[PDB]
Design a protein around this motif. Structure first.
Motif, mmCIF file in Angstrom:
data_model
loop_
_atom_site.group_PDB
_atom_site.id
_atom_site.type_symbol
_atom_site.label_atom_id
_atom_site.label_comp_id
_atom_site.label_asym_id
_atom_site.label_seq_id
_atom_site.Cartn_x
_atom_site.Cartn_y
_atom_site.Cartn_z
ATOM 1 N N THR A 137 0.815 -1.209 0.000
ATOM 2 C CA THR A 137 0.000 0.000 0.000
ATOM 3 C C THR A 137 0.858 1.271 0.000
ATOM 4 O OG1 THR A 137 -1.843 -1.104 1.103
ATOM 5 C CG2 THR A 137 -1.733 1.312 1.295
ATOM 6 N N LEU A 138 1.887 1.296 0.842
ATOM 7 C CA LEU A 138 2.796 2.444 0.884
ATOM 8 C C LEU A 138 3.506 2.631 -0.457
ATOM 9 C CD1 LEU A 138 4.269 2.069 4.475
ATOM 10 C CD2 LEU A 138 2.800 3.920 3.655
ATOM 11 N N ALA A 139 3.930 1.528 -1.068
ATOM 12 C CA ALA A 139 4.585 1.579 -2.374
ATOM 13 C C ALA A 139 3.647 2.157 -3.433
ATOM 14 C CB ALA A 139 5.066 0.195 -2.786
ATOM 15 N N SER A 140 2.390 1.724 -3.421
ATOM 16 C CA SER A 140 1.409 2.221 -4.390
ATOM 17 C C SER A 140 1.203 3.730 -4.271
ATOM 18 C CB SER A 140 0.073 1.489 -4.242
ATOM 19 O OG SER A 140 -0.633 1.902 -3.082
ATOM 20 N N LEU A 141 1.134 4.223 -3.037
ATOM 21 C CA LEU A 141 1.022 5.658 -2.788
ATOM 22 C C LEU A 141 2.246 6.426 -3.285
ATOM 23 C CD1 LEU A 141 -0.717 5.488 0.687
ATOM 24 C CD2 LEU A 141 -1.625 6.648 -1.339
ATOM 25 N N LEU A 142 3.435 5.853 -3.106
ATOM 26 C CA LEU A 142 4.648 6.490 -3.613
ATOM 27 C C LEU A 142 4.637 6.583 -5.143
ATOM 28 C CD1 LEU A 142 7.369 5.168 -1.128
ATOM 29 C CD2 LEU A 142 6.366 7.452 -1.272
ATOM 30 N N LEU A 143 4.127 5.558 -5.820
ATOM 31 C CA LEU A 143 3.995 5.619 -7.278
ATOM 32 C C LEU A 143 3.068 6.764 -7.695
ATOM 33 C CD1 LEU A 143 3.910 1.830 -8.298
ATOM 34 C CD2 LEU A 143 5.796 3.437 -8.608
ATOM 35 N N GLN A 144 1.900 6.874 -7.063
ATOM 36 C CA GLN A 144 0.979 7.973 -7.369
ATOM 37 C C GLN A 144 1.629 9.335 -7.119
ATOM 38 O OE1 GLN A 144 -2.184 9.680 -8.994
ATOM 39 N NE2 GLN A 144 -2.309 7.476 -8.610
ATOM 40 N N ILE A 145 2.287 9.474 -5.974
ATOM 41 C CA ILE A 145 2.912 10.743 -5.595
ATOM 42 C C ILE A 145 4.047 11.122 -6.546
ATOM 43 C CG2 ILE A 145 4.328 11.889 -3.848
ATOM 44 C CD1 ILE A 145 2.622 10.238 -1.758
ATOM 45 N N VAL A 146 4.918 10.165 -6.847
ATOM 46 C CA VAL A 146 6.099 10.439 -7.663
ATOM 47 C C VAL A 146 5.796 10.468 -9.165
ATOM 48 C CG1 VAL A 146 8.394 9.614 -8.316
ATOM 49 C CG2 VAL A 146 7.671 9.553 -5.916
ATOM 50 N N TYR A 147 4.978 9.531 -9.645
ATOM 51 C CA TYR A 147 4.756 9.357 -11.089
ATOM 52 C C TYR A 147 3.426 9.904 -11.612
ATOM 53 C CZ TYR A 147 8.852 6.377 -10.796
ATOM 54 O OH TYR A 147 10.122 5.905 -10.593
ATOM 55 N N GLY A 148 2.522 10.277 -10.713
ATOM 56 C CA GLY A 148 1.192 10.730 -11.108
ATOM 57 C C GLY A 148 0.270 9.563 -11.409
ATOM 58 N N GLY A 197 -12.980 8.938 -5.554
ATOM 59 C CA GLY A 197 -13.040 9.185 -4.112
ATOM 60 C C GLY A 197 -11.683 9.480 -3.485
ATOM 61 N N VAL A 198 -10.608 9.057 -4.150
ATOM 62 C CA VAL A 198 -9.247 9.340 -3.691
ATOM 63 C C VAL A 198 -8.764 10.663 -4.278
ATOM 64 C CG1 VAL A 198 -6.843 8.586 -3.690
ATOM 65 C CG2 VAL A 198 -8.676 6.898 -3.471
ATOM 66 N N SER A 199 -8.595 11.665 -3.417
ATOM 67 C CA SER A 199 -8.087 12.964 -3.841
ATOM 68 C C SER A 199 -6.652 12.832 -4.345
ATOM 69 C CB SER A 199 -8.129 13.966 -2.686
ATOM 70 O OG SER A 199 -7.568 15.208 -3.079
ATOM 71 N N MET A 202 -1.650 16.763 -3.975
ATOM 72 C CA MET A 202 -0.378 16.245 -3.466
ATOM 73 C C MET A 202 -0.379 16.088 -1.945
ATOM 74 S SD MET A 202 2.488 14.925 -4.028
ATOM 75 C CE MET A 202 2.252 15.027 -5.801
ATOM 76 N N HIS A 203 -0.816 17.114 -1.220
ATOM 77 C CA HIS A 203 -0.784 17.049 0.248
ATOM 78 C C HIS A 203 -1.780 16.067 0.812
ATOM 79 C CE1 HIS A 203 -4.006 20.033 -0.185
ATOM 80 N NE2 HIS A 203 -4.291 19.920 1.122
ATOM 81 N N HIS A 204 -2.858 15.797 0.075
ATOM 82 C CA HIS A 204 -3.796 14.744 0.470
ATOM 83 C C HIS A 204 -3.179 13.372 0.330
ATOM 84 C CE1 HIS A 204 -7.380 17.673 -0.407
ATOM 85 N NE2 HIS A 204 -6.770 17.956 0.754
ATOM 86 N N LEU A 205 -2.501 13.120 -0.787
ATOM 87 C CA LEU A 205 -1.818 11.838 -0.998
ATOM 88 C C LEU A 205 -0.694 11.632 0.019
ATOM 89 C CD1 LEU A 205 -1.562 11.879 -4.894
ATOM 90 C CD2 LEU A 205 -2.902 10.241 -3.557
ATOM 91 N N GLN A 206 0.077 12.684 0.274
ATOM 92 C CA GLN A 206 1.151 12.604 1.267
ATOM 93 C C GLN A 206 0.601 12.295 2.653
ATOM 94 O OE1 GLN A 206 2.853 16.438 0.549
ATOM 95 N NE2 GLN A 206 4.375 15.664 -0.908
ATOM 96 N N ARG A 207 -0.548 12.878 2.994
ATOM 97 C CA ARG A 207 -1.169 12.601 4.288
ATOM 98 C C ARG A 207 -1.683 11.162 4.362
ATOM 99 N NH1 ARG A 207 -6.339 15.663 7.254
ATOM 100 N NH2 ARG A 207 -5.663 15.216 9.402
ATOM 101 N N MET A 208 -2.193 10.636 3.248
ATOM 102 C CA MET A 208 -2.599 9.232 3.199
ATOM 103 C C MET A 208 -1.410 8.318 3.468
ATOM 104 S SD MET A 208 -5.040 9.052 -0.130
ATOM 105 C CE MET A 208 -5.114 7.273 -0.020
#
Ligand code: GNP
Ligand code: MG
Lengths: 310, 163
Positions: A137-148, A197-199, A202-208
């Motif tokens: 899950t953490l890895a998936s969030l990093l992909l969204q944050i870093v790669y869009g 439903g998932v914002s 950037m700051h929303h994803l980082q907080r997730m």
């Protein structure tokens, strides 16, 4: 015209230069004033002094440039390290005293990105032990944050190679676990991107990302170095993690979580030698001694963080 | 992942930090806090490749030769609101060419604060004219506040370094 200054680094390798209005007598509190931080952003962070093998949180009254100057002596007092190879730098990092209840309400984008960067740093270095599912899950969030957003054309195949994986999973998992997670990571990544439903702010994803780190036992820990003797008393070098939750021992080499104890479930005693401390674990009748010249620092922090807890 | 050393130059108050912080952090810096020397890191995708940008955000109120020695690409920023900041850039351009010992230096001229049309002093054609004078240098008018042409500054420098 002339003035003195110092670079204050963050875990991503970025830095801000701050004016030293009182030279090497400038205090941590004065340097914190000299940052570009609101009274909002400031209360969550403070100045740490860090070299490759020792990182210490400084007090508001400390004079950090004098700690840099005196690093060889500090290393000699607290460790057995090669002083020559340790060159310390000053960092802005999470205050170890920051209560989780306070952190959980943070909305400020800058505070979030600073906490996020530091959490990612700890994750990739192996200091966060968690089940495979959490790490995925953490890895998936990093992909969204870093790669869009996930795009099938870009990401479905030949994307998550060993170089790429290094930026989204712990280094301790790269060789034997991570290569078997790629489809699971890609699935969650795609699901993030396509879920309205998932914002995607950037700051929303980082907080997730932070929300997923908060329940990790060692989250927000200050780490100290020491040794334990196996209960033929073979030495095991360890990291001693102390945070607002309790005490945590990691195997230094493997980062394996050896024990995790919440405040109220254990007691400590500073050894009369001052080269160690003893821990007594409850509903267990089990005990152990950690040897370290940071014993005094560890026990003082335990007292403080236990004392904070209601 | 290749690393790109970018440097943001220009006089005081033109919006060097505001542009850099908007690009890197997605935050608009409202309060004026004069910079001593800040460095940022940001991974981005340009032309199908991941690039690690190291962005030096420099002091405008006033180490410079070193910045130009090490830097691979340069954003020269003025405010469309302040003539003097536009005037100040000629000498910086010349300094960069001297230190690099070549005309062939990745560079972009940036007229910032373009959201402030009511306060415009430097016409867009004067900016365009300067860019042409500079061996047909890249040129943009930007706004850190309105998020106009912010990313494009840094992406263009990366593309220039890649040629
Ligand atoms: N309206 C508007 N204001 C801006 C823009 N960019 C910066 N500003 C404002 O102008 C002021 C100065 O911006 P700043 O980025 O600090 O300028 P600087 O070039 O980094 N100054 P220095 O060289 O002293 O570090 C700030 O109050 C900031 O909010 C913009 O695009 N539009
Ligand atoms: Mg600035």
């Amino acid at each position: 015209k002339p003035y003195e200054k110092v670079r204050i680094y963050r875990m991503d390798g970025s830095y801000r230069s701050v004016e030293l209005k009182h030279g090497n007598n400038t205090t941590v509190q004065q340097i914190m004033e000299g940052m570009r931080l609101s009274q909002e952003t400031q209360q969550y962070f403070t100045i740490w002094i860090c070299s490759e093998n020792l990182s210490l949180q400084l007090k508001p009254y400390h004079k950090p440039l004098q700690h840099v100057r005196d690093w060889p002596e500090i290393l000699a007092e607290l460790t057995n390290l090669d002083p020559q190879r340790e060159t310390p730098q000053l960092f802005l990092r999470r205050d170890v005293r920051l209560p989780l209840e306070v952190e959980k309400q943070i909305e400020d984008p800058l505070a979030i990105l600073i906490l996020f960067d530091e959490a990612r740093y700890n994750l990739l270095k192996g200091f966060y032990t968690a089940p495979d599912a959490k790490l995925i899950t953490l890895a998936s969030l990093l992909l969204q944050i870093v790669y869009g957003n996930y795009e099938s054309k870009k990401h479905k195949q030949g994307f998550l190679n060993e170089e790429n994986l290094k930026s989204i999973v712990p280094v301790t998992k790269l060789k034997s676990k991570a290569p078997h997670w790629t489809n699971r990571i890609l699935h969650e990544y795609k699901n993030l991107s396509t879920s309205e439903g998932v914002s995607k702010e950037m700051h929303h994803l980082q907080r997730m990302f932070l929300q997923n780190c908060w329940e990790i036992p060692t989250y927000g820990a200050a780490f100290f170095t020491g040794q334990i003797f196996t209960k033929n008393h073979k030495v095991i070098p360890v990291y001693v993690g102390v945070n607002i939750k309790g005490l945590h021992l990691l195997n230094m080499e493997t980062k394996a979580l050896l024990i995790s104890l919440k405040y109220g479930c254990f007691m400590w005693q500073l050894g009369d030698t001052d080269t160690c401390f003893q821990i007594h674990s409850m509903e267990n009748k089990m005990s152990f001694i950690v040897h370290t010249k940071q014993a005094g620092l560890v026990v003082k922090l335990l007292m403080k963080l236990n004392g904070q807890l209601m | 992942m290749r690393e790109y050393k970018l440097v943001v130059l220009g006089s005081g108050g033109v919006g060097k930090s505001a542009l850099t912080v908007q690009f890197v952090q997605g935050i608009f810096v409202e309060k004026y806090d004069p910079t001593i020397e800040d460095s940022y890191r940001k991974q981005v995708e340009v032309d199908a490749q991941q690039c690690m940008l190291e962005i030096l955000d420099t002091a405008g109120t006033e180490m410079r030769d070193l910045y130009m020695k090490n830097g691979q690409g340069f954003a020269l920023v003025y405010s469309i609101t302040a003539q003097s900041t536009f005037n100040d850039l000629q000498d910086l351009r010349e300094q960069i060419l001297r230190v690099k010992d070549t005309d062939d230096v990745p560079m972009i001229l940036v007229g910032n604060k373009c959201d402030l049309e009511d306060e415009r002093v430097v016409g867009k054609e004067q900016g365009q004219n300067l860019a042409r004078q500079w061996n047909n240098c890249a040129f943009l008018e930007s706004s850190a506040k309105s998020k106009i042409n912010v990313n494009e500054i840094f992406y263009d420098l990366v593309r220039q370094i890649n040629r």
